[PDB]
């Protein structure tokens, strides 16, 4: 099948909102979707035979005297998993960081129960650097690991 990426645009943001609502256990607010339209290539949809089935949303973060890439959401609808879509999305954002060369690291939060996501990221060089107690407020478990890949 045809598996490729595309932009998040004002015309298709409704599809992104639906994908995130289906995939993730927490809701994202209007501000999140406003911000995704301002990050350029750091937010993308993933398509499988012309239907959007996944997405990645990141932002540049200036914290702890570093320039960091923060991955906020990265996911695929369950029927399309294990087809390389996650890999394509994550390699797209790693390619951007590589071209640039000015990022110190890439990081994200992940619920401690999500073993499969942790192992997926560990394949790309991410490591658990910290565990944030009560990061999530409405889901169980509430703890989040911080995964980081040093660039
Ligand atoms: C910042 C965040 O959003 S953290 C939360 C991440 N997202 C989620 O957990 C949402 C729900 N999960 C998903 O959307 C997906 O399972 C993802 C994003 C974690 C992975 O996406 P996929 O498209 O399924 O991954 P992809 O097919 O590229 O897998 C790459 C490799 O990771 C490994 N892998 C991925 N998922 C699994 C799994 N559940 N079990 C075992 N190995 C796995 C395999 O080694 C795989 O390669 P292989 O199939 O050739 O053996
Ligand atoms: C300047 N930063 C921003 O603009 C910005 C916008 S959203 C964001 C970050 C990204 C972070 N992403 C993850 O946690 C991913 C995806 C996912 O859904 N899960 C489960 C996972 O494992 N990993 C969640 N998020 C929160 O702040 C957040 C969001 C929801 C809740 C909550 N708790 N109870 N209800 N809602 C708690 C924290 N930052």
CATH number of the domain enclosing 70: 3.40.630.30
CB 26 near ligand 2, within 6 Å: yes
28 is in an annotated binding site: yes
The answer to whether residue 62 is catalytic is no
Number of domains present in the structure of the chain: 1
Which residue's alpha carbon is at the smallest distance from atom 14 of ligand 1? 75
The answer to the question of whether 86 is labelled as a binding residue is yes
Q: Which of 11, 33, 62, 70 is catalytic?
A: 70
Would you state the structure tokens that stand for residue 128, as one six-digit string? 């658990």
The answer to whether residues 53 and 46 touch, using CB atoms and an 8 Å cutoff, is yes
Question: How far from the centroid of its chain's Cα atoms is residue 72's Cα?
Answer: 5
**Ligand 1 atom closest to the CA of 77, numbered from 1:** 14
109 in active site:
yes
Q: Which residues have C-beta within 8 Å of that of residue 108, sequence separation ≥ 6?
A: 70, 71, 72, 74, 121, 126, 146, 147, 148
- Tell me how far apart the 2 most distant CA atoms of the chain are, in Å: 43
Q: Is 20:28 a contact under the CB 8 Å cutoff?
A: yes
Residue range of the domain that includes 103: 1-151
For atom 33 of ligand 1, which residue has the closest CA? 120
Q: Can you tell me whether residue 128 is helix, strand or coil?
A: strand
With a 6 Å cutoff on the Cβ, whether 20 touches ligand 2 is no
Residue found by looking up tokens 């937010």 in the block: 43
Helix, strand, coil percentages in the chain from 3-state DSSP, rounded to 5: 30, 35, 30
Ligand 2 centroid–CA 80 distance in Å is: 23
Q: Structure solved using which method?
A: X-ray
Rounded-to-integer distance, Cα 33 and Cα 16, Å = 8
User: Choosing from 11, 47, 109, 145, which is the catalytic residue?
Assistant: 109
Phi, psi of 136 (to 5 degrees): -90, 150
What single-letter DSSP state applies at residue 134? T
The neighbour count for residue 79, using CB atoms within 10 Å, is: 8
């Amino acid at each position: 099948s045809r598996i490729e990426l595309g932009d998040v645009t004002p015309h298709n943001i409704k599809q992104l909102k639906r994908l995130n609502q289906v995939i993730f256990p927490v809701s994202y607010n209007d501000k999140f979707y406003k911000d995704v339209l301002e990050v350029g290539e750091l937010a993308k949809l993933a398509y499988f035979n012309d239907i959007a089935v996944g997405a990645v949303c990141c932002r540049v973060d200036h914290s702890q005297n570093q320039k960091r890439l923060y991955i906020m959401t990265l996911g695929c609808l369950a029927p399309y998993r294990r087809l390389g879509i996650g890999t394509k999305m994550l390699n797209h954002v790693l390619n951007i960081c590589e071209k640039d060369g000015t990022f110190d690291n890439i990081y994200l939060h992940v619920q401690i129960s999500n073993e499969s996501a942790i192992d997926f990221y560990r394949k790309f060089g991410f490591e658990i650097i910290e565990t944030k107690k009560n990061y999530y407020k409405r889901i169980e478990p509430a703890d989040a690991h911080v995964l980081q890949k040093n660039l």
